[PDB]
Amino acid sequence: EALGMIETRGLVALIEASDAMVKAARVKLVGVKQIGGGLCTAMVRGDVAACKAATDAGAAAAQRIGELVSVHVIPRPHGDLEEVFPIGLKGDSSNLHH
Amino acid sequence: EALGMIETRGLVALIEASDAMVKAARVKLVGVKQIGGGLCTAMVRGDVAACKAATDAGAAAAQRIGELVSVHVIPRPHGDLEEVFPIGLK
Amino acid sequence: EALGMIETRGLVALIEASDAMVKAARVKLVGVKQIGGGLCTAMVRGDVAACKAATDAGAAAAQRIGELVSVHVIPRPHGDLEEVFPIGLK
Amino acid sequence: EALGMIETRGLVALIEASDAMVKAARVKLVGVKQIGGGLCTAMVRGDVAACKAATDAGAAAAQRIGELVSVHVIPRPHGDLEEVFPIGLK
Amino acid sequence: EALGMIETRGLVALIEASDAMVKAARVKLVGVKQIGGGLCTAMVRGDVAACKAATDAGAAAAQRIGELVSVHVIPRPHGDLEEVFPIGLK
Amino acid sequence: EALGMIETRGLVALIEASDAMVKAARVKLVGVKQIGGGLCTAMVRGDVAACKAATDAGAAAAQRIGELVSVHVIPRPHGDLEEVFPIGLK
């Protein structure tokens, strides 16, 4: 699956984009993270062409209400990019152990 | 049933808003928040019209005692939203 | 009972105003929450007027110690505000 | 019965401050604190005047190393301050 | 082995780097620390030749997606570095 | 024993300097720390001239990858500093 994300400086701006994203296309919202500075990021997985459209509409709704800084998509997430980023669906590592 | 929120720089603006918000219409305050930064956000959920009123009161009520950043209401939050954001009635 | 609250940008100013605040008149320091940002805020609850005297003086003493962001008071803090901000009696 | 503080933008400017304070006079360093924005505060307790020499010396040692933002001292802190502020003797 | 890292302002730029790093060459992505004002840093470890191919590609691909604040590889970090920084093979 | 320390803004910068720092003279990296705004420090102890040279190399190594806030040495840390700062050998 593709990785879509947008990062905003300003939460409210973030939630709105997350709303429009998951509304735009067939993409789930595998979570969000903030890292200080007021910067904070939301991330989604889906059909590549889904995550493309969602982010696109995400950036829109974001610019409208707040300060959007960056948006980007990644058709080919590195496998091991996960054990390190909230980019995960729950592969049930722990609920997978039983 | 709907979701209104406002984003400040300044806690004291955010608390004033909250207060105008609930006090302005029929909408329960479901989450405050922070993102490092000095920025933090308050949340409410009620009738579409309810949230627009309180949002309107808070934005204004904060305009006066500090920095306002953002107001918005989302009439019909996508379900996915809630599992991620502090946005539900517990 | 009313709610007084001051907010600054620097802990020193802050613990300073709270000290006037509590010294000025009939009020009790009840919470302090930090947004990081270098913004920090204190909270006290007296009879409305005891929170005006109290604040007024707090912001003063603060400003000499440096950078102050907000002062404000709310005589009748909406009820469910308590359950979301460190404003509560205890 | 004397409470000296220093506030810096930068840790190494504060670890210096404290080092000179404890050294200058007979005041007991009862805790550090940080509040985002790279601001943080060192606290010390002693003889009123002893807090004055110690502050004057530590403030001054930081102004050389870097970013100094606050130096104050309260000879007679309310008791409310202890239970909320980390100035506690321990 | 060698240790290369990239530091960004922005998590997104960051996430892209790592992804282009782990792709560019024979390197294992071993860490991501994070600090204030949204600077987050990313660790990797491999052939010193290989930590170059990667830091170069990860530096680049961030460049276009946002704010890069530093690239560097250390061929042979001291053993100390290990016990005080997220570099270690876990 | 003394104390060398070299504060930054930017982690990667701080890594290179802890490395070279510990690589310059004989000294022990006793620990690190951040306090927001993305300032952070490393802290080592060793024979006092150890620290002079090491700090001094970390400062150069640092001045280049990124931005350096503070270097300093305090040959004779007041024993008190140590129960409040990540300064000790544990």
UniProtKB/Swiss-Prot annotation, chains B, C, D, E, F:
Any one of the GO BP annotations: protein hexamerization
GO molecular function annotation: identical protein binding; structural molecule activity
What InterPro entries does the entry give? Bact_microcomp_CS, BMC_dom, BMC_shell, CcmK-like_sf, CcmK/CsoS1_BMC
What single Pfam family name could you report for this chain, choosing any that match? Answer: BMC
Provide the protein's localization. Answer: Bacterial microcompartment
- According to the entry, every stretch annotated as the BMC domain falls at 2-86
Predominant location: other
SMART domains xrefs: BMC (SM00877)
- Read off the PROSITE patterns from this record: BMC_1, BMC_2
* Assembly mode: Homohexamer with a central pore of up to 8.6 Angstroms diameter. The hexamers pack into a two-dimensional array. Interacts with EutQ.
**Function text:** Probably a major component of the bacterial microcompartment (BMC) shell dedicated to ethanolamine degradation. Each homohexamer has a central pore with an opening of up to 8.6 Angstroms. A positively-charged funnel leads to the pore from each side of the hexamer; a phosphate or sulfate ion is found in the pore. The pore probably allows metabolite passage into and out of the BMC.
Q: What is this protein called?
A: Bacterial microcompartment shell protein EutM
